Amino acid sequence: QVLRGTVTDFPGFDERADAETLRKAMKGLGTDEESILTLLTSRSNAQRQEISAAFKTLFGRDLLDDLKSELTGKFEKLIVALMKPSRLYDAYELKHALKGAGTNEKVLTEIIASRTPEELRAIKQVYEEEYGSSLEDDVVGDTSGYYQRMLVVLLQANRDPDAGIDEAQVEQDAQALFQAGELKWGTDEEKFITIFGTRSVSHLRKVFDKYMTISGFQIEETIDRETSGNLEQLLLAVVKSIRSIPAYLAETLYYAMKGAGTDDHTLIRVMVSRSEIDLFNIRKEFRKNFATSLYSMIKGDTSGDYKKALLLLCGE
Numbered sequence: 001q002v003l004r005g006t007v008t009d010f011p012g013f014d015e016r017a018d019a020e021t022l023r024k025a026m027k028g029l030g031t032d033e034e035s036i037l038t039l040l041t042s043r044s045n046a047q048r049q050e051i052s053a054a055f056k057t058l059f060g061r062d063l064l065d066d067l068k069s070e071l072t073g074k075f076e077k078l079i080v081a082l083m084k085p086s087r088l089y090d091a092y093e094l095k096h097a098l099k100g101a102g103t104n105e106k107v108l109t110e111i112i113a114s115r116t117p118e119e120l121r122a123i124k125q126v127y128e129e130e131y132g133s134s135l136e137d138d139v140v141g142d143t144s145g146y147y148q149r150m151l152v153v154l155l156q157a158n159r160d161p162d163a164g165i166d167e168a169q170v171e172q173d174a175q176a177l178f179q180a181g182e183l184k185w186g187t188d189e190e191k192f193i194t195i196f197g198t199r200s201v202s203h204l205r206k207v208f209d210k211y212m213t214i215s216g217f218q219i220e221e222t223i224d225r226e227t228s229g230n231l232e233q234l235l236l237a238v239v240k241s242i243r244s245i246p247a248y249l250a251e252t253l254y255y256a257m258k259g260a261g262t263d264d265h266t267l268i269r270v271m272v273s274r275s276e277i278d279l280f281n282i283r284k285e286f287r288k289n290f291a292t293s294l295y296s297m298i299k300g301d302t303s304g305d306y307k308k309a310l311l312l313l314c315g316e
């Protein structure tokens, strides 16, 4: 399918002109957040990096340090995130879910399950450069059990490529998965980890069909998203990503705003990271699955300059 983002290079871009607009906006008493916000959400990530350089050439000041001393709250978290160069974002997000006591298993599952092999290679590469330690050793050092192993398997970015679809292997995997599901994924974990983690995307889709034409239940129906289980949360995220990455991220966003509070960190992470990849496709899945639009949900769930920036990122 064709992936379309909501943010694209801004025509007639001038990094010096933009460097100055931002300077006048930060300069002196009071800040013009309305100006920063509108400027930053209509320039691609590559352009924001160019604005930063020109800002440094013209004033000898660091644009980001400035935005941080001037901005505050979720609006700042959102601006700081947009500034992060595209290639460094998932790696940064991953270093901070692992870093320190505990682990944000949520981010680890979300990024590793929804990212393609090419994306994971580049992430593994950029991560070691930036942080010195390899992603795989930090994951292995923070996670455990079959959760760790499944994450490590996916981290190898070695899913079979899509080619000849043997129906003998398909039915064999469907049966296996069926029986592992009936056992609530608590037995023979080794066998299913290999199927979910190394089988080609087109293969696993036939497996998901067959599996249901064996049980009458979609494979996800054998797992409760709401409840615990790191390994199950991962199996759920993988299944959904194998079906549709936008749909999976379309839902991750939904559950970020659905409830008593708002998971602004997820809301910010998915909005920013996918803005130039498939945020558009994500918007289309959100509407068709949740009967409402992302725009309209973000508008009612967030407030202020923060809300305005998300809405401009969202687009229509």
Ligand SMILES: [Ca+2]
Residues within 6 Å of the ligand: 025, 026, 027, 028, 029, 030, 031, 070
């Ligand atoms: Ca100021």
Ligand SMILES: [Ca+2]
Residues within 6 Å of the ligand: 030, 031, 032, 033
């Ligand atoms: Ca003000």
Ligand SMILES: [Ca+2]
Residues within 6 Å of the ligand: 068, 069, 070, 071, 072
């Ligand atoms: Ca501040």
Ligand SMILES: [Ca+2]
Residues within 6 Å of the ligand: 098, 099, 100, 101, 102, 103, 142
């Ligand atoms: Ca830790």
Ligand SMILES: [Ca+2]
Residues within 6 Å of the ligand: 256, 257, 258, 259, 260, 261, 262, 301
């Ligand atoms: Ca809410």
